[PDB]
Amino acid sequence: MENFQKVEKIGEGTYGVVYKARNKLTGEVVALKKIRTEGVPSTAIREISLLKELNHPNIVKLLDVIHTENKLYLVFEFLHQDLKKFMDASALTGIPLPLIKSYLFQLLQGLAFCHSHRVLHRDLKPQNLLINTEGAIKLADFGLARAFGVPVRTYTHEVVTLWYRAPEILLGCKYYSTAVDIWSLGCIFAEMVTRRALFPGDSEIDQLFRIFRTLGTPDEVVWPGVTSMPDYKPSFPKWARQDFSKVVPPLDEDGRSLLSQMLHYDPNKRISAKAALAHPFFQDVTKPVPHLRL
Ligand SMILES: CC(C)Nc1nc(N)c(C(=O)c2cccnc2)s1
């Protein structure tokens, strides 16, 4: 930008491009996101403006919002690494359980806060979870489908990741609940533990069927109303639920129990972020320092 000297391209989010940049005037280093247009919504910007007041230690701070030339710029505080990269970097040895637990706990604190302020993330994935040398982890790139909609890609031909999508979204539910974020986080928790994506679907139906093959094809017993959902087909195959001990070995029972509650099919049975924070799994939670190579 004009007052920003773009250092590098950080990524290409589902809405636009993200750059590492320095405020030529203040010298501060930030993450600048350019949003994908002829006029730009005046209502979505109020969804944005609302996010600026959403300040929490586990939520990436939105510093400024600038609308100019059919371009929408979001200025965020900069963090040096994302969880996807850290997970890849920790693949040989695995992220130590205490750090996994710390990250999960902080993310739940962040979501409990968002949710209590009636803000949904909608697109949690490792790439959107940022970490620093201090052991903190923060929620980034909040999805604005209620202020934009679900993009076919990101803005310019880019395969959208469905791995963390809640079943109700895949089954065509039109109104997302805070439960969608808990599902995504449960999938991420599993991935940190096993070092392999839990449900790596490559299409909406493959994603749905990967979930069904592991947790069992849902029915009216475990998910009242599921058969009346928009995209539910009576013709879906009927898979039996797999033993949960086979899904995330060698996670302890406290962890498996919490994970099971985060992955309940029924959005209403799925544990809340607030309740999850009180789960026995966190009795010995601490805040370890990660080994970050920048
Ligand atoms: C080097 C990267 C991990 N630094 C980033 N800092 C912030 N603040 C980012 C974002 O805020 C962000 C992440 C993913 C998609 N859109 C924005 S990325």
81 known member of a binding site: no
* Residues in the chain preceding a C-to-N separation beyond 2.5 angstroms (breaks): 36
Q: Measured in whole angstroms, how far is the alpha carbon of residue 94 from the centre of its chain?
A: 20
**Which technique was the structure solved with, according to the deposited record?**
X-ray
Structure tokens at 280: 């026995």
Cβ contacts of 39-46, under 8 Å, gap ≥ 24? 39/70, 40/67, 40/70, 40/72, 41/147, 41/148, 43/147, 44/144, 44/147, 44/148, 45/72
Q: Any known ligand binding at 127?
A: yes
* 143 and 217 fall within a common domain: yes
Check whether residue 70 and residue 124 sit in a common domain: no
Please check if 128 is assigned to a binding site.
yes
Burial 255-281 (b: 16+ CB within 10 A, else e): bbebbebbbbbebeebbbbeebbebeb
- Residue 32 and residue 156 in one domain: no
Task: Answer yes or no: do 57 and 85 share one domain.
Answer: no
Whether residues 134 and 68 fall in one domain = no
Q: Which of 48, 52, 128, 130 to mutate to test the pocket of ligand 1 (most atoms within 8 A of CB)?
A: 130
Last residue of a domain, one of 15, 45, 80: 80
Tokens of 38: 């002829």
Query: What residues are paired with 82 via a beta bridge?
Result: 130
The number of the ligand 1 atom at minimal distance from the alpha carbon of 82 is 3
**Would the CB of 74 count as within 6 Å of ligand 1?**
no
58 & 194 share domain = no
Say which CATH number the domain at 59 has: 3.30.200.20
The type of residue at 225 is: G
Which amino acid residue places its CA nearest to atom 17 of ligand 1? 141
Number of domains in the chain: 2
Q: Do 120 and 233 fall within a single domain?
A: yes
Contact 208, 170 (CB under 8 A): yes
Residues 89 and 218 in one domain: yes
Same domain, 192 and 276: yes
How far is it, in rounded angstroms, from Cα 257 to Cα 281? 8
The last residue of one of the domains, among 58, 80, 102, is 80
Q: Is the CB of 60 under 6 A from ligand 1?
A: yes
- Same-domain pairing of 69 and 86: no
Give the domain-ending residue among 80, 103, 135. 80
Q: Please give the residue range of the domain that contains residue 58.
A: 1-80
55, 85: one domain: no
Contacts of 57 (CB under 8 A, 6+ apart): 106, 109, 110, 136, 138
Residues 269, 218 share a domain: yes
Q: Which residues of 23-38 are buried (b: 16+ CB within 10 A; e: fewer)?
A: beeeeeebbbbbbbee
Of residues 35, 181, 6, the one with CA closest to residue 108 = 181
Give the CATH number, domain containing residue 232.
Answer: 1.10.510.10
